[PDB]
Write an enzyme that holds these catalytic residues in place. Sequence first.
Site, PDB file in Angstrom:
ATOM      1  N   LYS A  63      93.142  -8.691  62.878  1.00  0.00           N
ATOM      2  CA  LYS A  63      92.046  -8.024  63.566  1.00  0.00           C
ATOM      3  C   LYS A  63      91.556  -6.835  62.749  1.00  0.00           C
ATOM      4  O   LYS A  63      92.357  -6.053  62.227  1.00  0.00           O
ATOM      5  CB  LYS A  63      92.500  -7.572  64.957  1.00  0.00           C
ATOM      6  CG  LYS A  63      93.081  -8.688  65.826  1.00  0.00           C
ATOM      7  CD  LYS A  63      93.524  -8.167  67.192  1.00  0.00           C
ATOM      8  CE  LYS A  63      94.446  -6.964  67.050  1.00  0.00           C
ATOM      9  NZ  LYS A  63      94.773  -6.317  68.348  1.00  0.00           N
ATOM     10  N   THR A  95      88.082   1.760  75.841  1.00  0.00           N
ATOM     11  CA  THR A  95      88.740   0.920  74.848  1.00  0.00           C
ATOM     12  C   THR A  95      90.193   0.609  75.192  1.00  0.00           C
ATOM     13  O   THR A  95      90.895  -0.004  74.380  1.00  0.00           O
ATOM     14  CB  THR A  95      88.665   1.586  73.475  1.00  0.00           C
ATOM     15  OG1 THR A  95      89.185   2.920  73.566  1.00  0.00           O
ATOM     16  CG2 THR A  95      87.225   1.636  72.999  1.00  0.00           C
ATOM     17  N   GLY A 141      93.442  -1.175  76.447  1.00  0.00           N
ATOM     18  CA  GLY A 141      93.850  -2.550  76.658  1.00  0.00           C
ATOM     19  C   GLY A 141      93.145  -3.593  75.818  1.00  0.00           C
ATOM     20  O   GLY A 141      93.219  -4.782  76.155  1.00  0.00           O
ATOM     21  N   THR A 142      92.450  -3.196  74.749  1.00  0.00           N
ATOM     22  CA  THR A 142      91.745  -4.173  73.926  1.00  0.00           C
ATOM     23  C   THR A 142      92.702  -5.144  73.245  1.00  0.00           C
ATOM     24  O   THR A 142      92.392  -6.334  73.126  1.00  0.00           O
ATOM     25  CB  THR A 142      90.893  -3.461  72.873  1.00  0.00           C
ATOM     26  OG1 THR A 142      91.666  -2.425  72.258  1.00  0.00           O
ATOM     27  CG2 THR A 142      89.651  -2.854  73.509  1.00  0.00           C
ATOM     28  N   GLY A 143      93.873  -4.673  72.831  1.00  0.00           N
ATOM     29  CA  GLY A 143      94.817  -5.517  72.124  1.00  0.00           C
ATOM     30  C   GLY A 143      95.477  -6.526  73.037  1.00  0.00           C
ATOM     31  O   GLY A 143      95.588  -7.708  72.701  1.00  0.00           O
ATOM     32  N   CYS A 144      95.924  -6.058  74.200  1.00  0.00           N
ATOM     33  CA  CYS A 144      96.551  -6.936  75.182  1.00  0.00           C
ATOM     34  C   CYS A 144      95.585  -8.000  75.685  1.00  0.00           C
ATOM     35  O   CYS A 144      95.923  -9.180  75.741  1.00  0.00           O
ATOM     36  CB  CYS A 144      97.103  -6.126  76.364  1.00  0.00           C
ATOM     37  SG  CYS A 144      97.927  -4.616  75.808  1.00  0.00           S
TER      38      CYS A 144
END
Lengths: 258, 258
Positions: free
Chosen positions: B173, B205, B207-210
């Site tokens: 990413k 922004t 929790g974008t990864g989860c």
Amino acid sequence: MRVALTIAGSDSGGGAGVQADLKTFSRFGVYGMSALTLVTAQNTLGVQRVHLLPPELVYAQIQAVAEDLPIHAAKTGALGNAAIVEAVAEAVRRFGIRPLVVDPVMVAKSGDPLLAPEAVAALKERLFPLATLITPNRLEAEALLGRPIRTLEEAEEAAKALLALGPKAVLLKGGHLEGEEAVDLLATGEGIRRFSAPRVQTRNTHGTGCTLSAAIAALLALGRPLEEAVAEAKAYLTRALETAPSLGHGHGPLNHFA
Amino acid sequence: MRVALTIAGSDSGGGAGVQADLKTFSRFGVYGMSALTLVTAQNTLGVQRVHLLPPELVYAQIQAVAEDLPIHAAKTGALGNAAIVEAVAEAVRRFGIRPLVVDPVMVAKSGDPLLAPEAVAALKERLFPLATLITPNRLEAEALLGRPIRTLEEAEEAAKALLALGPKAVLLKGGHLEGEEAVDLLATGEGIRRFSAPRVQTRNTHGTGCTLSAAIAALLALGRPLEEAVAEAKAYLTRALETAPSLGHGHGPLNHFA
């Protein structure tokens, strides 16, 4: 966007607990928050491990979410022990968490006790006065009152008697059965109201208690009146039972997308 | 009904962790299961309390759900420490939990480390070989490889190098930025592919990864091809960022209903 908070345990299988609570919030369009009281290893065959969280961690989660985010409604579920119960009521009072749907979670639908008597006394003395609504099942109401509930007259009188403990409203789930229907008794100071529901015959009955109270709190977060909220929540639970996936080998989960 | 499992921490504020994972599963119609690795008191302003669960409780939750329910896909999130990481990999291998989307969760987007070096070594040695897909951010890939990632050439070579650790696929990413777009590099044995995404400018922004990895695992549970799954997951994350509620005072949650 409206927000609802659940204060309940964790069901690893996703059919009950905070998992069922959050899935219900998403079904109704409510943003979901959760303060974990305990963690379980669990599936449709039942629980295998139960880990109660420190009462201060349960308080910290409520303090962190309430200090930062709106709470338009909330519900409580499994609370583990008397110490966690006292900590939850102390947070709910300090932070003004209303409307609050307190699901007793003291006696299982199977009749197995879920809470120690010291925890039940804390639940009645500390948490019940803060509840805008409690949702006992018939066995739970008999334990809270010390009286049998066997007729429709006894159910109505029982639901009125529970208002003496503090809650602004009482929904006595399953307080009277008539043939293939089941009757819930909603008692307030205004009087008593009845809610019919068909008696589904299925293995997929896991999480029925959590899901109903979470749907009531979600509808309350949307601003619906309490009578319309409990009515619309029961219709969703009936559809969730009728269309439930046949997942698992035992008591299967509800279909929360229904 | 397809089922997906998340193995991650608990975010009391509901924007990240198992809360964001389950909310994403419901958005895609997947039944959601969760094995908790840790509990946090957390809001949009950040974490205030972190409680790591016993490694055996994390194993028990995975064992209870996998012994009883189908797992059509799964993802891992925050894993706390090396002991929990080893227990998760031992369960995933024994129970054959594939497809598995392993989100590293070792370096925050802010650059703060999230995992001890002993936990990182266990994550590379034990969990990575089991992963069908890993989703490092650029800083995380630099830590795993020990090499800088500063050009598009270095990003492509980095994503290929990570395949040597075991994962069948690598989604690097943000491995290259060009103006107002951000480029993800998907590397498999077939070669490398690029995925563009606009660079949103917002506080919301959290929790974008989860959310991204959970959407990939949800689409994999539905049987979508990996390239189509990562592409459709990125479009959902872009819409969730663009339409996010302005909840909280800090890094706000995404709009998971988008």
